[PDB]
Amino acid sequence: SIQQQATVMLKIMQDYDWHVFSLVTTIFPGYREFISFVKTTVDNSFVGW
Amino acid sequence: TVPQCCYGFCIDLLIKLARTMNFTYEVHLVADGKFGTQERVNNSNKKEWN
Numbered sequence: 001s002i003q004q005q006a007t008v009m010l011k012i013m014q015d016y017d018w019h020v021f022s023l024v025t026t027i028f029p030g031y032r033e034f035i036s037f038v039k040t041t042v043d044n045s046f047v048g049w
Numbered sequence: 050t051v052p053q054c055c056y057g058f059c060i061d062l063l064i065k066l067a068r069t070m071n072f073t074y075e076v077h078l079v080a081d082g083k084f085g086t087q088e089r090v091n092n093s094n095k096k097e098w099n
């Protein structure tokens with residue numbers, strides 16, 4: 001699922017010493033909930049990207 | 050959960066606010082016993098207030 005892919009991307013960014021990122025998306029069905037999920041994950045994470 | 054008797058500066062301010070705003074206050078005590086903040090207890094990443 002795309003949410004698992006987003007979590008993997010966040011973990012890769014954390015391991016790569018990349019604590020700053022920008023989310024650039026495009027209008028396409030299904031991506032809004034993915035953006036909401038990644039925002040909730042980065043907010044609830046103690047890493048603090 | 051026995052009912053105790055509590056008072057002090059905070060309850061006096063609460064009484065003043067209730068008198069000025071017609072509030073019917075229901076005093077309760079924190080079961081956790083702490084101020085509480087974002088802490089990780091379980092479910093990995095969880096910044097839930099306690």
Ligand SMILES: *[C@@H]1O[C@H](CO)[C@@H](O)[C@H](O)[C@H]1NC(C)=O
Nearest residue numbers: 066067068069070071072073
């Ligand atoms: C709360 O404030 C509003 C406007 O400042 C006022 O109309 C209202 O009466 C106030 N509430 C009480 C309980 O006085």
Ligand SMILES: *[C@@H]1O[C@H](CO)[C@@H](O)[C@H](O)[C@H]1NC(C)=O
Nearest residue numbers: 066067068069070071072073
């Ligand atoms: C206080 O406000 C309440 C509204 O919830 C009203 O019913 C009551 O009459 C007010 N008391 C006085 C003394 O004006």
